[PDB]
Design a protein around this ligand. Sequence first.
Ligand SMILES: [Zn+2]
Lengths: 170, 126, 101, 209, 57
Amino acid sequence: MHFNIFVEGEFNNVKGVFIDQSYPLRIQCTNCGSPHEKSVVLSEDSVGEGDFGEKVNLGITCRCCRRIMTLKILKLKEGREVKKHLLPTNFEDEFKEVWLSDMQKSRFLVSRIETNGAEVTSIESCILNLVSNQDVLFTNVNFEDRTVAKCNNLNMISSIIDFSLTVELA
Amino acid sequence: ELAAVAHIKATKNDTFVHITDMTGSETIAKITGGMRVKAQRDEGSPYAAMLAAQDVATKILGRGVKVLHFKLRGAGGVKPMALGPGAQTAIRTLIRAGLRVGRIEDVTPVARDRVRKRGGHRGRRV
Amino acid sequence: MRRNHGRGKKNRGSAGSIQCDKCGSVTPKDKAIKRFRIQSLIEQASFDDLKQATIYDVFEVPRMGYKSQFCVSCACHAKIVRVRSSQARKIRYGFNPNRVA
Amino acid sequence: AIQPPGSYPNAFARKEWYTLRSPSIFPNNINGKTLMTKSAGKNSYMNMIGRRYDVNQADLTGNNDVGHRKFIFKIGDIKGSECVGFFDGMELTSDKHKAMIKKWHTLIEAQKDIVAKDGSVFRVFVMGVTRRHPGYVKKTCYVKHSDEKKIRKIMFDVIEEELSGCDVQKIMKKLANETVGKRIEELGSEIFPLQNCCVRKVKTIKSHQ
Amino acid sequence: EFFGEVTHVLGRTGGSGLLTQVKMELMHNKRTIQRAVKGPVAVGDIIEILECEREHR
RNA sequence: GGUGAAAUGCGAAGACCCUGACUGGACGAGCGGAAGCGAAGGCUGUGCUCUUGGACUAAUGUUGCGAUGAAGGACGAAGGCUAGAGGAUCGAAAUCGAUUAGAUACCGUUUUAGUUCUAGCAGUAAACGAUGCCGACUGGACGGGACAGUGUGUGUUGUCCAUGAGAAAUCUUGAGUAUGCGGGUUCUGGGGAUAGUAUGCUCGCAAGAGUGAAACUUGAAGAGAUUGACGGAAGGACACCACA
Ligand SMILES: [Zn+2]
């Protein structure tokens, strides 16, 4: 069962968004219904092993159902989702590198997960990154608790209102 | 009162809970555990058979049905013919919602001279 | 190993074959492992709730009989049959059809 | 909900309820209701003719020691707000049928056709098992092959001098009292003692009614 | 609620030796009954119930 | 739906599930067993018909007409091949999806020859009890199947114990009856490997079958049993450097 992470709200002078692939969430055991009482962190450099010995990111043993549960991150293959871009620099060819998804239905795709035996029901936080409409990049944009990010490129305002993160089955 | 029949198919995957007429030609409710979970591995477990026999309970219990005659089955034929795990936990969940019980029977299909089935001369080597 | 040579066949050439109930492999009928069981149609941890639900004044819960048939690999793996020692290999168990009840 | 929300693309109140009524031979004539989807105005209810239902013989005639037998009826007429059934078959329940076959015994079976008085044709299947006498000490109880061919000839004659040209109202009277299973067990037990002799099933091949 | 006094200790059969089978004897109307408990029970003890309709074995 | 878990693939032109009618090929469950029959290969629905076997029972006929058997002849699982008919299920080859360091494999999806019948060719199997045929003689115990008798007999056959035999495992109408060595009559073997390979010949539509060497190489290859070591072997006990 595959999941998708999205960013919602109304966007003003934004061109792209991207998380850094490391964030906490909350899971719950299928065949049980009982939820995990903590928030686990799912990075992309972690290592694990399932029942057949495959290489996954995280591994938890469901207490009630009494089996193993695995999660792992996919990468959003570069031919249809990420659409390589560039950005400005000094006079010789630096041209800073970035990948940015597409705004299909008034939201951006940022990550993709594959799950066995567990099930994600929420996500707590992340590390946000903003790309101006022309060329300037804001890193680690401190979003409000009131869900409005805002930064200024020395004159103008790029901002996002009604900010939230979701998890939809794919 | 008013009586209906409950056809309950239960195998290693995906129990069924299907309620019909006395003739059997008119359906009153049909909910399969398997449209209660999101993992394909657990379509046929006893927790998903309890989530399925509770929706069927509240619905037909307002549509006027009071009594139930049962008809159980496995998969029969050239397939394994014995009731699965989520069989007994859908019956016990309807008996508690308030319904009464009539006759009980087992109606699995019996091959009296079958056809050949999968695997070969050596079987499925896993 | 055995004086059977592993199967109950005497004074005939061929003896008919069957397909195993778990993997589906082809085996002689005299060599397969066969088991018979009578199970109640309703679970035993559910009889109390069924005595208040019944509408008839007298009810008998049904029972069915089942014959099973497996191959040597599938019965050994499933622990239907186990490895025995050299002398205990010779002990056969039966049914006695002349028992009183 | 296994699928994502959208990927792949009250009528019950406007229905009808009828009443099923069985033949008047049995005391309990009323056996339940049956729905009907009102397809059209002045809906031809010939879509409700042909349906088929069964009832346990312990419910037609309130009695408990005969609850191992069933009767099967077929709808053939509508009178106002009420349906009528006709005799269509008979069978044993699968749990009682299984309990008569025994390891180390012989099983004899026959079958035969009969013709009723109006021309309806029925097939009849019969059954029997061998019996041990009160001082038995062997392991098997088997009849010789040439003597199963003699008991089978007897089973063909009992079937066709009772169930023959005769009304259908009484063919349902001697299928309920076990008249055929009791003649088989005395004419046939003079070749070998038998037990569990019964009619196993009845089919309708071609009815008139 | 109801009551009952344990009078026989059949055995300890749990997943990891946690539960213990027992044979109670209801008191408002005498009836032996099997039942599984969870704590450290002895003989002569009187347990509570809130419904007496199961036997477990 | 199926899986250790999934993916390809099927589903709003309504699948899956429940019901009324039909069509088609294949198969003959349970009863079904250390039970029967056939030269062997093999043979389980019911009723008719043409053919067949061994045993038993007897004051029938005949009168040695017999045992073995290079050369010759007929039959012979499954797969394959040649013609016609047929087409449910399963499925080599091909093909994608997984798994993997890699898998042209195990597991799965799409889809074939074949799998069935009639008429033939072919001639092989761990075609095995890995156990020529005929004749004489030999202790017990518990059984089965057929016939005849009346407290038993003849032909067959399963299990278990001695005597005897054997390198031992084991054998019990024989693997017994003395190296104390001869009842009649055949076949096959003569250290391993080269090799059931070359060549000639006979048979076959073919695929192949039958018969069948040498040069050169080499000190062991093999049978049955004993004590150890090991097993991604099975059990029974145990332990807050194990769990609850
Ligand atoms: Zn198997």
